[PDB]
Design a binder for this molecule. Sequence first.
Ligand SMILES: [Zn+2]
Length: 359
Amino acid sequence: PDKLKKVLDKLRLDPKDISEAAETVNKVVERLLRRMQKRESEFKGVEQLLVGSFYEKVKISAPNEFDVMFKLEVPRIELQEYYETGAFYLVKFKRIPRGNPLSHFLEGEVLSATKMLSKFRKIIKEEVKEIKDIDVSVEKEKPGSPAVTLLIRNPEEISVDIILALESKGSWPISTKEGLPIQGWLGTKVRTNLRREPFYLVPKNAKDGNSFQGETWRLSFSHTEKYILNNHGIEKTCCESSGAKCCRMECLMLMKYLLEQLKKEFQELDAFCSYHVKTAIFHMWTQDPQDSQWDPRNLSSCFDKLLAFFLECLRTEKLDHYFIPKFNLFSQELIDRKSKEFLSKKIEYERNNGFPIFD
Ligand SMILES: [Zn+2]
């Protein structure tokens, strides 16, 4: 209780420090954006997913890291499910446009994610080289990442992930039909309105051995996930000025920070990522939908039942993608059986000893 609240103080974003990064992040992102929007650029139609504010780009439990999506509203595309996860797809056009630059990235009828990302990376590398009023560099490509990560230092280093994405305003793929099970929690009108919004595809960028590995795209619901984080209560006034504070976000920050610390010491946890944590708490928020089940006075009790739920996902080797029920993020083919039992052992140790890793 007293220890968990003390850890949250160092994780909470100082509005004075996050504002100083807003000027630098916006300036660099805007410059790269207007570079992509030139006549020669094949990404001339690209736009920013979340525009206006700056907390939409910051990553929780990560004060110096930021995510930005560069979305491209392509013509009417047709999706082809690539293997039976429901998250990965080949992308074709219903009618290939005549003078569109995206045709340069076609491998037959399918749009090549890896070629688009390569040319995406080059245009970014060229523009950041011309940046001399602020030290900006392009980090080496992370395997499996759809993003071109920038390294900005003035004076402390901050990270900006520039994610390439296709925007589709068509209907969400059929694999999501039973996903987003928020009816008892956020309600059916929220779920209907959310599923009227676009969906996004990002390069899988995974050397999986398939013949279409460079043409594979992954479903992204980062916009829907951000909405849920900002609108996480059954009552509309949850965490508002005239409402009651809850500890949902604090439990997520604690769980995310507990995993990232365990990952820095043990390489056996490399297959785990913070998305497993956000997926797990989404299911927890669906299981415990009442705002009173997340009272800030029960912080320790709420953080403990999140750990127990997570350990239950490791034990059963089952963690369905919140938007794609058929996609088990904890299947053997994605995470080894020994890694789950290892993470379970370490979490039980931290849980039983007052979390010594937070010292
Ligand atoms: Zn709340």
